[PDB]
Amino acid sequence: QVQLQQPGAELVKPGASVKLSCKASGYTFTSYWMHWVKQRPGRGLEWIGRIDPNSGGTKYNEKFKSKATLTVDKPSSTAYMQLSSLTSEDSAVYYCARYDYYGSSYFDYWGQGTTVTV
Amino acid sequence: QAVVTQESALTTSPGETVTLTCRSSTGAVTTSNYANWVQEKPDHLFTGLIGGTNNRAPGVPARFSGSLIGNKAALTITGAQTEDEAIYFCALWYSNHWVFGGGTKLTVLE
Ligand SMILES: O=C([O-])CCCCCNC(=O)Cc1ccc(O)c([N+](=O)[O-])c1
C-alpha cells in the first residue's frame, strides 16, 4: 500500500501563481525520485521535471524553466511544484509519480493528480 | 527535441494477443532509453506496468510483458481480457529529459 496524495483542484483567474503539493506514505520518501507530469488531451503527457529529495536538486524540462519551481519538505514527506504566471495554457492535470532512480526503472505509483482550470 | 511515437489505437478481441510498440525520432530504442509503459484507465487513473524494458510492476497480471522488437520498445498482452481496456503510454529517457509517447488506446473486445 504505497500512496501519493494530491489535492484535487485549483480554479484561478489568469496570471495567478499556485503552489502544488504531493504527499507520500507507505514507503521511504527520500529513497525515490519525484517527477511532475502534465496532461491535457492531444496525447497530453509532458514531463515537467524531477526533484531529488536528498539533494534538493532538480532537473527541469527546459520548456518549463521560467515557469515551475520544485521544492520539497523532508519532514512532511511532501513534494512541491510552484507555477508562476498561469498565462492560461495550463488548464491541465498535474501529476506526481514515483520513480526509482536507484532501481527497476519504473513510474510505479502515481498520484491522483491536481487539476488546474484557469 | 525528440518525438516518441506509438500507435494511436489498437483494437483487439478477448482471448487474443496484442502488441503495442514505442518509436524514437533519434534512432533505435534499446535498453538504455529506459522504456516504461504506463497504463491509464478511464477517468484519469495511472499505474506503471513495465519499467526497465522488461520488468513488470507488482500485481500486474502475467498476461503483460515488455521487451524490444527491433528498433522499438514493446508491450505484449496475452489473452487480452476486458479489464485491459485503457490508454497505454510509453516513455523514453533521452539524455536530459523524459519524453512521453502520444499514447495508445487499447480497445479490448472490439
Ligand atoms: O543504468 C544502469 O546501470 C541500471 C539502472 C540505472 C537506470 C538508469 N536510469 C537513470 O539513471 C536515468 C536518469 C538519469 C538522470 C536523471 O536525473 C533521471 N531522472 O531525473 O529521472 C533519470
Distance CA A100, CA A30 (A): 11
Question: Solving technique for this entry?
Answer: X-ray
Q: Which three cell numbers stand for residue B99?
A: 519524453
Q: Which of A20, A26, A5, A1 minimizes the C-alpha distance to A86? A: A20
Question: In this complex, which of B45, B89, B96 lies closest to A45 when CB atoms are compared?
Answer: B89
Distance CA A59, CA A50 (A): 5
Per-residue b or e along A41-69, where b marks 16 or more CB atoms closer than 10 Å to that residue's CB: eebbbbbbbbbbbeeeebebbeebeebbb
**Which residues make beta-bridge pairs with B45?**
B41
DSSP chain B: ---EEE-SEEE--TTSEEEEEEEESSS---TTS--EEEEEETTTEEEEEEETTTEEPTTS-TTEEEEEETTEEEEEEES--GGG-EEEEEEEEETTEEEE---EEEES--
For residue B106, the domain's CATH number is 2.60.40.10
3-state SS assignment for residue A16: coil
Contacts 24+ apart (CB under 8 A), B11-15: B11/B107, B11/B110, B12/B77, B12/B80, B12/B84, B12/B106, B12/B107, B12/B108, B12/B109, B12/B110, B13/B80, B13/B109, B13/B110, B14/B79, B14/B80, B14/B81, B14/B82, B14/B108, B14/B109, B15/B79, B15/B80
Question: Distance of CA B56 to CAs A11, A38, A106, B52, B64, Å?
Answer: 37, 24, 9, 9, 8
Q: What angle (nearest 5°) sits at the alpha carbon of residue A111, between those of residues A108 and A116?
A: 140
The count of structural domains within chain A is: 1
Domain around A37 = 1-118
Residues in chain A closer than 8 A to B89 (CB atoms) = 45
Domain around B17 = 1-110
Q: Which three cell numbers stand for residue A95?
A: 501529476
Phi, psi of B4 (to 5 degrees): -110, 120
- Ligand 1 mean position, distance from CA A26 (Å): 23
Q: Which of A4, A28, A9, A26 minimizes the C-alpha distance to A96? A: A4
The count of structural domains within chain B is: 1
For residue A69, the domain's CATH number is 2.60.40.10
Q: Which residue has the cell 536538486?
A: A57
Interface of A with B (CB under 8 A): 35, 37, 39, 43-47, 59, 61-62, 93, 95, 97, 100, 104-110, 112-113
Q: Which of A94, A75, A88, A84 minimizes the C-alpha distance to A24? A: A75
Residues 6+ apart with CB under 8 A from B55: A104, A105, A106, B66
Q: Between chains, do A105 and B98 touch, taking CB under 8 Å as contact? A: no
DSSP A61-109: -GGGTTTEEEEEETTTTEEEEEE----S---EEEEEEEE-TTTT-----
